[PDB]
Amino acid sequence: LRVQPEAQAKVDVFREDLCTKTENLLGSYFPKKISELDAFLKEPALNEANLSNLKAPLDIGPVNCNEKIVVLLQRLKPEIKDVIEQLNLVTTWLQLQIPRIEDGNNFGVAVQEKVFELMTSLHTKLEGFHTQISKYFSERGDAVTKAAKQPHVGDYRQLVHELDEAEYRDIRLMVMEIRNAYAVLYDIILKNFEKLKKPRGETKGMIY
Amino acid sequence: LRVQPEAQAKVDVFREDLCTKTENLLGSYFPKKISELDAFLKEPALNEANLSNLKAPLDIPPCGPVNCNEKIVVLLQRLKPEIKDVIEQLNLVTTWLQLQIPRIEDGNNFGVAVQEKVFELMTSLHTKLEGFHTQISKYFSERGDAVTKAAKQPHVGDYRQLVHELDEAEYRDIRLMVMEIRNAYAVLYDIILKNFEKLKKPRGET
Amino acid sequence: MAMLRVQPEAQAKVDVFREDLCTKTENLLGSYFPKKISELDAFLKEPALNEANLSNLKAPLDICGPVNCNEKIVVLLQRLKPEIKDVIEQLNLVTTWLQLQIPRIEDGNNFGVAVQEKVFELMTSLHTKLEGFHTQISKYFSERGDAVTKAAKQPHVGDYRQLVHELDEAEYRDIRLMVMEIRNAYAVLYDIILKNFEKLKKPRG
Amino acid sequence: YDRGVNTFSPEGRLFQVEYAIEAIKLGSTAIGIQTSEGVCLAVEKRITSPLMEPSSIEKIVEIDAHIGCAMSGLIADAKTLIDKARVETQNHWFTYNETMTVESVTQAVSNLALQFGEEDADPGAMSRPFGVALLFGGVDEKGPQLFHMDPSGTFVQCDARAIGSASEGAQSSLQEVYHKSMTLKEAIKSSLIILKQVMEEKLNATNIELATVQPGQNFHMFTKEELEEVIKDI
Amino acid sequence: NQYDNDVTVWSPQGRIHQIEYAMEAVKQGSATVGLKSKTHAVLVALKRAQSELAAHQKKILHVDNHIGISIAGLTADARLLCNFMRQECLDSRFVFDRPLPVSRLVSLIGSKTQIPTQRYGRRPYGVGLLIAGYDDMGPHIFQTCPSANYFDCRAMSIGARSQSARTYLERHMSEFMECNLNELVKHGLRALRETLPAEQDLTTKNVSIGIVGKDLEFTIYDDDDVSPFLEGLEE
Amino acid sequence: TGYDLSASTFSPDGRVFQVEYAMKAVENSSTAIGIRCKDGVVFGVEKLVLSKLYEEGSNKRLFNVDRHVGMAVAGLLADARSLADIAREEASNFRSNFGYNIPLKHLADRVAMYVHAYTLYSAVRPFGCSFMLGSYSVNDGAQLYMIDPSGVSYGYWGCAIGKARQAAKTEIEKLQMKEMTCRDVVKEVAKIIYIVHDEVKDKAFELELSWVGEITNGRHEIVPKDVREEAEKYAKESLK
Amino acid sequence: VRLSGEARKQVEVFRQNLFQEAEEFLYRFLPQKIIYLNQLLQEDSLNVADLTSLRAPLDIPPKCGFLPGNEKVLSLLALVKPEVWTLKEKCILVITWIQHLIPKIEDGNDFGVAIQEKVLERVNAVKTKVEAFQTTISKYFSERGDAVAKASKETHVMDYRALVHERDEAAYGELRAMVLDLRAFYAELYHIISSNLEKIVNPKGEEKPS
Amino acid sequence: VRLSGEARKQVEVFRQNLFQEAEEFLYRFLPQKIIYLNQLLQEDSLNVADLTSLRAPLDIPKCGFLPGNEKVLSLLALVKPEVWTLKEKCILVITWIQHLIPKIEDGNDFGVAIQEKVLERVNAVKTKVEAFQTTISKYFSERGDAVAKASKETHVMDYRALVHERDEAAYGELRAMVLDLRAFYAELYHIISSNLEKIVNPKGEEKPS
Amino acid sequence: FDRHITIFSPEGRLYQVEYAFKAINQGGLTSVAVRGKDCAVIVTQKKVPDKLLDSSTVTHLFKITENIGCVMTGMTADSRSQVQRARYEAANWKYKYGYEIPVDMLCKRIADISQVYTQNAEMRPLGCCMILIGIDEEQGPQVYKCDPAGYYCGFKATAAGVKQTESTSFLEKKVKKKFDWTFEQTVETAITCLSTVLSIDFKPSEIEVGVVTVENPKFRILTEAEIDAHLVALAE
């Protein structure tokens, strides 16, 4: 193909924009964003020891759930969406740094692929975290409906109380998963960055 | 351990009968059926350009009994034993091949992997043949459910075209099943006849 | 050229059949298929498949009378039926012809048998796509009537009419991509045959 | 690594030697010329830095007064072959008291190239083939002669043969421009036109080297005098 | 698979694939043909040029006055056997003052070809050799193989597309014995026609020949004398 | 498993596969037979015709090792031609030393030493041909030994090698070969080869016979054309 | 086989036409389609920070008021969804363009083969993610069908009928991530193909002095 | 570990009983069950060529009792015990081969690899036997739910047309299972008998050390 | 990797040497030898696959020197190789030290030749075990057995082959009784051993019996006619 100094350079600018962001994220956004989740987990609302008080009593219309737990779900949900955005920006940046395909000097390419495969674990888990939260709504909504359908069984009220604790338990887990999603990822990038951003090339043999 | 000649004499005669059947099955039965199945794929009763006999003019109250499609089921009446023939006879060829597996020892045991490739295809063939009887069952069930939902919802006319599509979907599958049956006899006898030298003698001769 | 008593009479019957497999498929591979390749690419350039504005595909739901199927959806499916029906038949005939072209397997590593499987791997992936295309055809009207039935259960839900509206847009684009796979079914297979036609045999040396 | 040097391919080729001829595509573009009035050889120096002296690097050296040289790919592989080529050339005159013909030059080089081997030999034997594409020209009583040699070791009499990275399109271009009786000065013209077109750098006296051999004039290395004239007389 | 690595490893069918691929490399190159009458023997070598600018390669290697050979296979691999074959023929006249018999020479060349085969690390020679010669018993056409096998033939065609050439040689073999030197070249050149496609057939430029005879020592012709040899013949 | 990759590696069942493959390489060779009797040892070789272009007498499988020692080979032809010169140089070094012709038991033993020496290492390969060594002497009489890819000597009253083997060996057992005379052996040797070979893959062939014994005056000699065709005509009686 | 003179030439013309058609795509249109979705994502419609007003509140107290779809999300997919399906159509021809460049099949000199296999593997990987989005695009519309119906059917529970609105904020947050990767699909596949264009269009040496 | 004398006897009696059962498995059980099903296949009960007369059409309505197929229900009395028996016997074969596993060494382990291949071939049979148990319970679940569904739906008759197909598909499967069970008996015979040398004695214990 | 060439196994074994032990066992021939008071006898299985084969052309009893006999069991390819190599030694012994080589040094030199096969990875062990007999003026009858590994020791009663396990058991049963050692009655013990194991009653041409005595230090091979006399007439 030919050369287009304008339209083709707009692609290089898109890469230089992600390269400018990547250095700005590592030096500024990531160290602050990782620390914000630390104080987020230290919040006394997530440190609650006794979950017997957060059990939502059902009146068996006068039907409602625990609002404090829902607010805890409303606080964690943006943090789950924030890491998914940062996960896609790094995944795109790692793909644009892949050099040409050659048999020799391909060890550094496999290093970039090894770090790239570490992201796949985060792509699946982060989507499973939000899907599991939305699944709790249907589980707790049907448990009350089944109790409202047949006004006999009292285990559905205990099932809601269990799912009240089941959400809070998985919240503290996900908060640690979100914090580890930034922290471990930020360490992996620093562990493979400096001289291994361009592992080989720009060296050659003095002759041919 | 001490071998039992009575148990050996029984099983050996059983496999010799399988070898006797395999001779008349492969060298005789298959070519006569391949030409019969090839003529059936060319028969106007099966291959048809005009599907107008497959139409489902839904008439949707106590209503009345809804029968099946006459052209499909009568065509299935011949199809089902043809599938039953290719299932049972390929199981006899499989049983014969499993008895042709040689003994175990490390001296020059290669080349026997040809047998592993023979029933590797018949394993995939038995999977397709099993789905043929299942697809025939799925037609009566899905067509009946669509008419049942049509009787429950007379205000939805999508089931009228749905039953029509099911009638044409099964009919197109009927011809494709016979194509797999003819190819089951053709490709099997083709692979055996090519490899028969080392299929009957996996290790050759000592 | 053999030992055992296997009947030469019926052996001559399967020979003529395998000779018919050879003669006909050679006319299918190098004549019928390249004739269809020209017809499939032009069938994509036809306004039937390639169209920019799909707003003509709607969900005429009255939710009380009968709710029929979208006209342009049924017409395009009826045009898609001969294409999927023919490509499944042709790829099954080439698969058997390929099994006939596989020589007698004795021993050693032959570079011929290697890609002969790859040619079968190509048709195997094509068979899976074609079985899925026909499977989606039955699922289009099945989920259509179910969505309209759910609309009759809750007439106040407008998401069903929008879902049927959005499915019809996906049904159209799938059909266009199905023919593109049908074109690539013959085109890629016909090309690979012309890339190496000498590898399927080891004689006349 | 999971393969041998002499292992045959299923298509009847050597893994080793095939990559040799495959390796020479990264060399420097050079073209030989055979004319009725003499032999002409040109080579691109391919200097990677101004600090590197283009005068010290020589890809055309004088074996005998008649015969020149050419180099491509790895330079030291050619130097190893030219060393023994100059020894046997003087061994010729040491015996027969005459100059070695251009054909006998390549015969000695073809023998040294064919000896490549590893096992069942002495450690003083060359294990792998050279990545050089050789062009041996010269003029004798038989007249101008130009031969081509690749890592295979064959030598064939040819009017012009292109070597290096551009040898693909150059050899087809040398065919078109060169015909019939075209002489030295007319050969340098079409030579520097095709070479300057294919190489990245523009033509300069220090970017390339040129030398010719005539029946009456022996091998003459062109100095700054002759080099600066032919580049502006192109 | 794992049996193709070297010559020493035998296949489970009892075949050396390296020797098999050595015969494949011979089919990868220029096709030569030769034949013998009761008197004269001719070696027709097909010269091929890579491009039109480059000239045609030399397929004929002069051995002795009574012996000549044509090469089909890897080019430079024949140079080692060439200088060896020439040295053996000189040593015969250096000691016995007699030309080495044609059948005895090929038996010695087939020995040097077979020795590196069974010994690991030595590459077998991947070039085929069609050698001719004359002695008191008449001319001889000896075709060899990289396996070191050598036969005795009235006429033989080796190389790529030699099938239709050999078929022509078999039907006309009865004439090859009774024809004179002129008719041997004619039918010998028309046998080379089948080795090339229907577009490029034959020219005097790319086709060279050589002949040996009763009172005539082995000579090599390329263009000049070949032009009247080709012209005057129907194809 | 990788246990067959070299001859120096033993099978976990205690076998050598590379040498066994060399025996399977002999199974690809054409059928050759030989028989010894009181008068001498009779040889025969099936010569396959690949094309009409071959001169009469080409592809000769009958090798002359020494004055009293002939040889017939089945296998790779060049491997036999290479060993034939080794056997000739060996018998020549014997007479140059001890001053007489080497006996068949001594020659076949030293050749087997060279054959088995190549089966020992990993740097070489065994011979891909199995051959027969006949001899005749007034001190001994008709003697026939056989060498295999493993380099072991086997004496035989009659024997068969090549592709079809067991079938020809049984036919030899059906008739006692010691009482018959060389004149009548070439009749049966010709009749057997006609029974051994049928036309399926190969097309045509010819009979190559060799004589050693009293009729040849203790010297390896090829069969004459007149007597060979005469014995073939008697063998054509079974064909008609 | 038997190659018809007319039928083969019809393909050979179309072999070059579809090959030159992708070159026009690989050169002019891919750098353009990268920046088109960039201006699509920079649109403030997808960048809205507050998702409270972005949901589709349902009126649930049957004569209960008609509940329509979400016109905000539907208008967003009106721009995004045609680009998602168009991308897949562009990649299929690239898959054809890569499979059209499959070199003459041989045992050796597979260096040009491994380049095309790794590119085709990554194009199929992106194509899988595109059709995976197309499933979730049509799936959320089926999610709204069950959520709104079950919420309007059950009037006893006053919470979960409001909790189905969280899927509206869920689709918006996922859509912004899907259109984010949608933009990268043109950029990632361009860098893979454009950098390797050396031996992709010519996966043959075709220098063989033998 | 430490153990008493009764501990060895409880295991030894199990080793003796399972060995004698495995010996009576190969030379008694297998040759008896091969001809047993072969007589059932030749018996006119399983040999019926007409699958249209084996169907049991039921009316579509004090509603009359609707029985199942008399032929299929009677033939499953032959099929079902043979499915449970072969599954129980293969387990005794799988277990008895596991006791023959020699003390594990890091080399010369091909004798163990032979037993591993035998266990995988028996596990493949055991899996197909468990699939036969599903087939037995399938006909009762498919015919039962559908006929009442065909009973409650008088508008759609073709439900019974599938019920007619359940009768033909069952008899086709009822004969195919016992045909495979007899084949399984033949496969277990040829695999164990030919490999009996390396199954019982995988290691010759010729080690000179 | 360790199962192919000769290198130290993680358990301390050598698989290339052990697979050779199965190669001697693979030959399908069982050999036994017993050292008596005044004599040493060797009895091995003589197999004749086809009637076209000849007797004197195939024999398992070889003579290293006049006073030392040799029997071989394994693949005959390795059988003839060691015997020629042993004759290059036993003869060389007389050229240097000037007397008949003892059975002690003959087994030591042949072992050293086999020890190099195991130590040097270029070569391979040989697939035949060697049992050497003879007599010396001090220790009398000498019977040794050299494995391809290079180990050899004095064996009162030795055995080899497929039936070696069953052969060793019956050789123990005879010695457990303190069997009186006489010449021909010991020859029975070696023959009755192979006779009771296979349960055949071999023909005279199916066995090959060597003998050596104090009265006759020169190795001898028992005549097949004398074999028939001590098979049929004395089975007792």
Swiss-Prot record, chain C:
Pfam families: PA28_C, PA28_N. Gene3D superfamilies: Proteasome activator pa28, C-terminal domain, Proteasome activator pa28, N-terminal domain. Keywords: Proteasome. It comes from the Eukaryota. SUPFAM superfamilies: Proteasome activator. One of its GO terms (molecular function) is endopeptidase activator activity. The keyword Lipid metabolism does not apply. One of its GO terms (biological process) is regulation of proteasomal protein catabolic process. Belongs to the PA28 family. Implicated in immunoproteasome assembly and required for efficient antigen processing. The PA28 activator complex enhances the generation of class I binding peptides by altering the cleavage pattern of the proteasome. This is Proteasome activator complex subunit 1. The gene is PSME1.
Swiss-Prot record, chain D:
One of its GO terms (cellular component) is proteasome core complex. The modification Phosphoserine is found at S9, S49, S56. InterPro entries: Ntn_hydrolases_N (IPR029055), Proteasome_alpha (IPR050115), Proteasome_alpha-type (IPR023332), Proteasome_alpha_type_5 (IPR033812), Proteasome_asu_N (IPR000426), Proteasome_sua/b (IPR001353). Component of the 20S core proteasome complex involved in the proteolytic degradation of most intracellular proteins. This complex plays numerous essential roles within the cell by associating with different regulatory particles. Associated with two 19S regulatory particles, forms the 26S proteasome and thus participates in the ATP-dependent degradation of ubiquitinated proteins. This is Proteasome subunit alpha type-5. One of its GO terms (biological process) is proteasome-mediated ubiquitin-dependent protein catabolic process. It comes from Bos taurus. Glycans are attached at S191. It comes from the Eukaryota. The modification Phosphothreonine is found at T48.
Curated annotation (Swiss-Prot), chain G:
This is Proteasome activator complex subunit 2. It comes from Homo sapiens. Signal peptide: none annotated. PANTHER family: PROTEASOME ACTIVATOR COMPLEX SUBUNIT 2, PROTEASOME REGULATOR PA28. One of its GO terms (cellular component) is cytoplasm. The modification Phosphoserine is found at S4. Implicated in immunoproteasome assembly and required for efficient antigen processing. The PA28 activator complex enhances the generation of class I binding peptides by altering the cleavage pattern of the proteasome. Pfam families: PA28_C (PF02252), PA28_N (PF02251). Belongs to the PA28 family. One of its GO terms (molecular function) is identical protein binding. Heterodimer of PSME1 and PSME2, which forms a hexameric ring. Induction: By IFNG/IFN-gamma. Transmembrane segments: none annotated. GO terms for biological process: regulation of G1/S transition of mitotic cell cycle; regulation of proteasomal protein catabolic process. Keywords: Acetylation, Phosphoprotein, Proteasome.
Curated annotation (Swiss-Prot), chain I:
It is found in: Cytoplasm; Nucleus. SUPFAM superfamilies: N-terminal nucleophile aminohydrolases (Ntn hydrolases) (SSF56235). The modification N6-acetyllysine is found at K94, K96. It comes from the Eukaryota. The modification Phosphotyrosine is found at Y151. Pfam families: Proteasome, Proteasome_A_N. The keyword Acetylation applies. GO terms for biological process: proteasome-mediated ubiquitin-dependent protein catabolic process. CDD domains: proteasome_alpha_type_6 (cd03754). Component of the 20S core proteasome complex involved in the proteolytic degradation of most intracellular proteins. This complex plays numerous essential roles within the cell by associating with different regulatory particles. Associated with two 19S regulatory particles, forms the 26S proteasome and thus participates in the ATP-dependent degradation of ubiquitinated proteins. This is Proteasome subunit alpha type-6. The gene is PSMA6.
